[PDB]
Amino acid sequence: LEELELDEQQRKRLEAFLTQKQKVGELKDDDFEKISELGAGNGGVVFKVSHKPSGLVMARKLIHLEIKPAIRNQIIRELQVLHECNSPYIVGFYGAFYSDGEISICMEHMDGGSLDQVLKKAGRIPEQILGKVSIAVIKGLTYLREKHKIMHRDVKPSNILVNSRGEIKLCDFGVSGQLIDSMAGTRSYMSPERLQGTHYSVQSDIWSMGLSLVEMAVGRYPIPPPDAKELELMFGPMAIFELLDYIVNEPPPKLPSGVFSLEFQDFVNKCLIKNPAERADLKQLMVHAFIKRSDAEEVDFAGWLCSTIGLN
Ligand SMILES: Cc1ccnc(Oc2ccc(-c3cc(O[C@H]4CCC[C@@H](N)C4)c4c(C)n[nH]c4c3)c(Cl)c2)n1
Ligand SMILES: [Ca+2]
Ligand SMILES: [Ca+2]
Ligand SMILES: [Ca+2]
């Protein structure tokens, strides 16, 4: 597929990452010094850490799980597949280990945080910026399914990471069933077919992307749909079980009219079709008018991001 083709800068950055990764070796707990907390989520807390021997900065997720040695060793072995997941749209992997009752997963550090954190600072994320995000998510989901036969299964703003170089990468995609079962995470982004028991596919991840795009475009979780008074304040309390019933039984959310392009509205509409068979697939989204316009658009995402969250 032509979408998995890499630019020259992408190929250089991937090769540089792999070159620095080869110099690391077996990760051990005492080789890390904590710098700051990047946030909690998906069963653990993530810290920005320094790997003292190599000097690299990493993101370290610690999942407190009291498990027998055998259980931990299968998880660490199942997570070894992440060494082969190398893509400009997937966060890079360093290693996994067990120490004093906590599983550690050490990955590439994205100094822009997650898009749920960016959204809180920005209020709303512009359409041209969301075009770049859509391209990255589509290509990331394509790489995972095409090169590894993996579904992400948890697309949401907090699982999309960005950095000051303009890169946009996915994270928190399951690869270890033992780790999943051992943990025993919000379902507010799950497709109505997954919430109804009907088995999952990449179409479920496409629903989650469309819902995430709508939330970032309007600045609020779009379910329940906003009132006209909320819209006039935006452009000029359901419990969790009630919310999940709303997703299955009510029409999907949509962007407001007049403030977004029709190509963007049509793009998220084809993502949020409740029937997974009528919902667009990755191949069709890759050639959608909104995506073709966005790829031709020359958006300084890094410049927008650094000024929005104040990286400087
Ligand atoms: C592929 C895979 C399979 C199984 N398990 C895991 O475990 C993980 C998952 C994710 C990270 C992770 C999180 C990061 O921010 C979090 C902040 C709070 C909300 C969260 N949704 C994102 C960052 C940042 C900013 N830069 N790099 C990061 C890496 C790590 Cl380290 C290990 N991964
Ligand atoms: Ca420790
Ligand atoms: Ca220790
Ligand atoms: Ca997970």
Swiss-Prot record:
Signal peptide: none annotated. Belongs to the protein kinase superfamily. STE Ser/Thr protein kinase family. MAP kinase kinase subfamily. Ras proteins such as HRAS mediate the activation of RAF proteins such as RAF1 or BRAF which in turn activate extracellular signal-regulated kinases (ERK) through MAPK (mitogen-activated protein kinases) and ERK kinases MAP2K1/MEK1 and MAP2K2/MEK2. MAP2K1/MEK1 binds KSR1 or KSR2 releasing the inhibitory intramolecular interaction between KSR1 or KSR2 protein kinase and N-terminal domains. This allows KSR1 or KSR2 dimerization with BRAF leading to BRAF activation and phosphorylation of MAP2K1. Widely expressed, with extremely low levels in brain. Changing residue 184 to L: Increases interaction with KSR1 and BRAF. The active site is at 154 (proton acceptor). ATP binds at residues 38-46, 61, 107-110, 114-117, 156-159, 172. It comes from Homo sapiens (Human). GO terms for cellular component: axon; cell cortex; centrosome; ciliary basal body; cytosol; dendrite cytoplasm; early endosome; endoplasmic reticulum. Changing residue 20 to P: In MEL; somatic mutation. Its EC number is 2.7.12.2. Dual specificity protein kinase which acts as an essential component of the MAP kinase signal transduction pathway. Binding of extracellular ligands such as growth factors, cytokines and hormones to their cell-surface receptors activates RAS and this initiates RAF1 activation. RAF1 then further activates the dual-specificity protein kinases MAP2K1/MEK1 and MAP2K2/MEK2. CDD domains: PKc_MEK1. This is Dual specificity mitogen-activated protein kinase kinase 1. (Microbial infection) Acetylation by Yersinia YopJ prevents phosphorylation and activation, thus blocking the MAPK signaling pathway. One of its GO terms (molecular function) is protein serine/threonine kinase activity. The modification Phosphoserine is found at residue 182. The proline-rich region localized between residues 270 and 307 is important for binding to RAF1 and activation of MAP2K1/MEK1. K-252a binds at residues 108-110, 158. SMART domains: S_TKc (SM00220). One of its GO terms (biological process) is ERK1 and ERK2 cascade. Coiled coil: none annotated. It is a peripheral membrane protein. InterPro entries: Kinase-like_dom_sf (IPR011009), MAP_kinase_kinase (IPR050915), Prot_kinase_dom (IPR000719), Protein_kinase_ATP_BS (IPR017441), Ser/Thr_kinase_AS (IPR008271). Changing residue 176 to A: No loss of activity. It is found in: Cytoplasm, Cytoskeleton, Microtubule organizing center, Centrosome; Cytoplasm, Cytoskeleton, Microtubule organizing center, Spindle pole body; Cytoplasm; Nucleus. Residues 32-291 form the Protein kinase domain.
